[PDB]
Amino acid sequence: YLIVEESLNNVEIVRSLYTKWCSLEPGVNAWNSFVDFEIRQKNWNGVREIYSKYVMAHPQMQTWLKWVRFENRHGNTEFTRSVYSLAIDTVANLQNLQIWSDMEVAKLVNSFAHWEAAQQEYERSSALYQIAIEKWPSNQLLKAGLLDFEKQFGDINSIEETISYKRKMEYETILSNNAYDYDTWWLYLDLISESFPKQIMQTFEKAIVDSRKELSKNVQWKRYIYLWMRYVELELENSLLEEEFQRLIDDIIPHKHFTKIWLMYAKF
Amino acid sequence: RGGISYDQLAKLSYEKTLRNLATQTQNSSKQDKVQKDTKTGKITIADDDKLVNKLAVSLQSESKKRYEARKRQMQNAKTLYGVESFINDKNKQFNEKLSRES
Amino acid sequence: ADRELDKEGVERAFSILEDALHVPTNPEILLEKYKNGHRKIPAQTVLFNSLRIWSKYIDYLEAYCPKDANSSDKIFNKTKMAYNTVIDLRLITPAMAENFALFLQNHYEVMESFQVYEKTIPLFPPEIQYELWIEYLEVATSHQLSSLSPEHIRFLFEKALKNLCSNGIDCKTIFIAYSVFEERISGLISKSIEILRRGAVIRLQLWRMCISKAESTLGPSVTRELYQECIQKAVEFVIKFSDFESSIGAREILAYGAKLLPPSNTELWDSFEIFELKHGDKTYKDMLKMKKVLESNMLIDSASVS
C-alpha cells in the first residue's frame, strides 16, 4: 500500500497509513521505515513525535539509542540531552520492572557520558557515573564502563583511585576460585598494602594467613609476619611455630628475655 | 547465513523500490487531495494522470525484467548440466533438485 | 599553502588553510547528503573530510611548534585542538595516531598521550591495534616520566592481552612485555603462568620453549609440570622440547621418546633425542642398542600396518 502511494506522491495518505499501522504495534521494521519516511519528508517535528511513541512500543536501548543517533546526527544540543535525560530517568523509575539488563543499561550510561565529554563538560559526565553506580550497585559492566571513560578523560589520580577497586574484585574472585596460588597472594596483599591502607589492610593479612602449608606457602606467612612486624607479634609467632620443637624451646628460653623480638622471630 | 524471512525481504524490496523511486525523481529534476462525498460515504482522490502511468509502466517493466531473467536462467539451466542420463527436461530438472539437496 | 609558506609567514599559511577546515554544525548529515547527492551538491561544503588537507595542515603546526612547548604556548594549544578535531571527525589514520601520541611525549605531556592510545584503539580493527598496543604498552613501561602504578600497568596488559587474543592475533610480543617487566618492578617468577597462556591460547612453540628454560634457573618443581603440559609436525617438536627438559633434570625421558614417537610417520629426530640422552651420561651401550632395537621393531610394525 505504501510504495503505490509513494509513487503517487500522496504524502498525507502514507502518513495516515503509518499512523494506523504503527497503532497495531507491529514490530521494529515498521517504525524504522516510518522514521525513514519523515526524513524523506523533512518533517523534523513529526519524526521526533514518532520516537516518543516508538520507545513506548519497544522499550529497549537500541530504540532509545536510535533516537540519540538521530539527534546527534543533527547536532541540536538542547534537544539531545533532553532525550538523554528522559532515557536515564525512565530506566531509574521503572527499575522494579526488570526489563533492561546489566549489559543493556551500560550502553545508555556510556553513550550518555561520552556524549557529554564531547560537549566539554567532564563534571557532568563524571557525576552521572557515581549516581549510576549508586543507583545500580549490581552491574559490574557499568562499573567497568566507568573505568574506560576515566582512562580517556579523567586525571591520573582518579584513574588510580578506580583502577585499585577493579584489581581488588578480580584478585578476590580468583582467590575464591583458585585455592593455593601463592604468587597472587603476594600481589593481593601488596595491592592492599600499597593503595588500600585501612582496617581491610590488617584484615586481609589475617585472611591470607588463614589460607596459609607448602614451602611455597610458608614464605607468605613470613611476609605477613613482616607486614605485622613493620606495622601480639610474639603471640601469633608461637601459634604458627606450633606446626613442629624441643631444641627450639630450649633455644627460645635462652634467647627471648636475654637478648629481642627479632631474636624471637629468628627461632621461627 | 540462512534464508531471508518474508518480513526482511518485504522491507528490502520496499527499500529498493524507494531507491528506484528516488532516482526517478532525481532524473526528472535533472531533465528539466481528498474529497469525501455527501450523498454516499464514497471518497474521491484527485490524481495526476502522470505517476499513475509511471507506476503502471514500472510494474510492467519490472515484470518484463524478472520474466527475461528467469527465461535466461531457463536457458542456462538446460544448457549447463549433461553428465547424468535423463529422459526429458523434467528428469534433469528433478535431478538438479537432488543435486541441490546434497 | 606551499607558495605562501615560502613568500610569507607560516601564520599566513595557517590562515589561508584555516578557512578550509570549518566544521560547521553536523558532519554526519553533510557527508551523507554529499554522497547521496548526484553531483549537484558541491564538495565545498564537505571539504573538512579530506585527510590530505588535515595532515599537511598539522605538519605545518608540528613543524612550527618549538622544541620546548610545555602547553603554555598558543601553538601547542592550537595543534592539540587541531589534532583532537581529527579524532572527533574520526578521519585519523593509525600512522597519524602515532604521530600525535609521539607529539605529546616529546613535549612532556606523557600522561595525556595514554589518553591518545585509549581513544583510538576502540575505533580500529585488530591487525592494526597490535601495532598501537606495542607503542602504548612500551611507553607505559619504558618512558621515564610515566609514573603508573604496577596494578595500573597490569591493567593495561590484561585489558589488551585478553581483548587482543579474543579477536585472535599471535600476540608474541605483548606476552613477553608482560613477562619481561614483571621482574623489573615486582620481581617474582609469576612469569610462567603469565607466559603459559601464550603457549595455550584459545610461534607458540617459540614462546613455550624459552620460558621452560627460565624455571630451570629458579626451581625444578615448576619445570616438571611444564614438561608434562608441553606435550599436550608441531606435536613432534613439542616431544623434542620435553626430551631436552629431561636432560636438564632419563627413564622418563626414554619413555617420553616412546610417547612422542607414538605421538606421530618419521621419528629419527626422536632417535637423536634418545641418543642425546644416552650421550649425556659420562652407562652401558646395552640399553641404547636395546632402545634402537625397540625403535626399529616399532618401524617394522608400522611397515606391516602399511
Swiss-Prot record, chain A:
HAT repeat ranges per the UniProt record: 9-40, 42-73, 75-109, 113-145, 162-194, 199-230, 241-268
Function per UniProt: Involved in pre-mRNA splicing and cell cycle progression. Required for the spliceosome assembly by promoting the functional integration of the U4/U6.U5 tri-snRNP particle into the U1-, U2-dependent pre-spliceosome. Also recruits PRP19 to the spliceosome, as a component of the NTC complex (or PRP19-associated complex). The association of the NTC complex to the spliceosome mediates conformational rearrangement or stabilizes the structure of the spliceosome after U4 snRNA dissociation, which leads to spliceosome maturation.
Intracellular or extracellular location(s): Nucleus
Family, per entry: Belongs to the crooked-neck family.
More details: Present with 2140 molecules/cell in log phase SD medium.
Name of the protein in its database record: Pre-mRNA-splicing factor CLF1
Portion held of the full protein: 139 to 413 of 687
Subunit structure: Belongs to the NTC complex (or PRP19-associated complex), composed of at least CEF1, CLF1, ISY1, NTC20, SNT309, SYF1, SYF2, and PRP19.
UniProtKB/Swiss-Prot annotation, chain B:
Top-rank taxon, per record: Eukaryota
Localisation per UniProt entry: Nucleus
Range of the intact protein held here: 92 to 211 of 215
Name of the protein described by the UniProt record: Pre-mRNA-splicing factor SYF2
Family recorded in the similarity comment: Belongs to the SYF2 family.
Subunit record text: Belongs to the NTC complex (or PRP19-associated complex), composed of at least CEF1, CLF1, ISY1, NTC20, SNT309, SYF1, SYF2, and PRP19.
Organism: Saccharomyces cerevisiae (strain ATCC 204508 / S288c)
Listed Polar residues bias regions: 20-32
Job description of the protein: Involved in pre-mRNA splicing and cell cycle control. As a component of the NTC complex (or PRP19-associated complex), associates to the spliceosome to mediate conformational rearrangement or to stabilize the structure of the spliceosome after U4 snRNA dissociation, which leads to spliceosome maturation. The cell cycle arrest of SYF2 defective cells may be due to the inefficient splicing of TUB1.
Anything else known: Present with 1670 molecules/cell in log phase SD medium.
Swiss-Prot record, chain C:
Family in the record: Belongs to the crooked-neck family.
The protein's name in its UniProt record: Pre-mRNA-splicing factor SYF1
Range within the parent protein: 492 to 819 of 859
Chain positions of HAT repeats: 29-63, 108-142, 148-184, 194-216, 218-247, 249-278
Subcellular location: Nucleus
Summary of the function given for this chain in its UniProt record: Involved in pre-mRNA splicing and cell cycle control. As a component of the NTC complex (or PRP19-associated complex), associates to the spliceosome to mediate conformational rearrangement or to stabilize the structure of the spliceosome after U4 snRNA dissociation, which leads to spliceosome maturation.
Assembly with partners or alone: Belongs to the NTC complex (or PRP19-associated complex), composed of at least CEF1, CLF1, ISY1, NTC20, SNT309, SYF1, SYF2, and PRP19.
Coiled coil: none
Gene name in the database record: SYF1
Note: Present with 2170 molecules/cell in log phase SD medium.
Domain of life: Eukaryota
